Design a protein around this ligand. Structure first.
Ligand SMILES: N=C(N)c1ccc(Br)cc1
Ligand SMILES: [Ca+2]
Length: 223
């Protein structure tokens, strides 16, 4: 997160860190057994880390649970990033509490102009790299479809939306991949892509979760 703020420990209790020896992506806990992340975060050997604030220190509220299965969306296209969503099943159910809590899926698609909360442990610099160890947060509005397509002509599908600031300076970034965009208390987006981070006229692009609720619900019901 570039240009954001330190959230405060466990104030984003649905935020997870995906660890394969190191933190490599975020995700969102949607019930005690399932995490939503980006398809571009797929790899083997995933451990889901819940209740995290500082990802380099065991502070006492964490739960570390190996993934038993990952399910990348059948239509994910890694060239265009269309359908950039994946489900991760936990080997055992998380113990839900005030610091580890699920986030609801949307029932409708959020509107342009809605202020959302984006969070993660990604790079905090728009040039160079610095990785924070505590969770960072960013308030960002959903941008109009017209502005999004003007920023990325020929690249925005109906399964994507832009959020952030066209003037730059505030954005998600590498390492935030797969983490939540929460609007009106529900999971509306997944950190997906963007040209650089926090660059002028290059806002963040996010998977449009409201288009995947049927697939999520049916997949969870059978796995
Ligand atoms: N929002 C962005 N600018 C962005 C986020 C994650 C990755 Br990976 C690349 C770009
Ligand atoms: Ca920790």
């Amino acid at each position: 997160i570039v240009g954001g703020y330190t959230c405060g420990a466990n104030t984003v209790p649905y935020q997870v860190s995906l660890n394969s020896g190191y933190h490599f992506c975020g995700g969102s806990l949607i019930n005690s057994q399932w995490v939503v992340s980006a398809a571009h975060c797929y790899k083997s050997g995933i451990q889901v880390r819940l209740g995290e604030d500082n990802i380099n220190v065991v502070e006492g509220n964490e739960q570390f649970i190996s993934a038993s299965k990952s399910i990348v969306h059948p239509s994910y296209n890694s060239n265009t990033l269309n359908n950039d969503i994946m489900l991760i099943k936990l080997k055992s159910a998380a113990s839900l509490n005030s610091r580890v809590a699920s986030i609801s899926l949307p029932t409708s698609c959020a509107s342009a102009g809605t202020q959302c909360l984006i969070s993660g442990w990604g790079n905090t610099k728009s040039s160079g790299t610095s990785y924070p160890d505590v969770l960072k947060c960013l308030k960002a509005p959903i941008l109009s479809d017209s502005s999004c397509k003007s920023a990325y002509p020929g690249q925005i599908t109906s399964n994507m939306f832009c959020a952030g600031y066209l003037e730059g300076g505030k954005d998600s970034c590498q390492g935030d991949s797969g983490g939540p965009v929460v609007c009106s208390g529900k999971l509306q987006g997944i950190v997906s892509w963007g040209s650089g981070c926090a660059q002028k006229n290059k806002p963040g692009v996010y998977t449009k979760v409201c288009n995947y609720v049927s697939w999520i619900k049916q997949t969870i019901a059978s796995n």
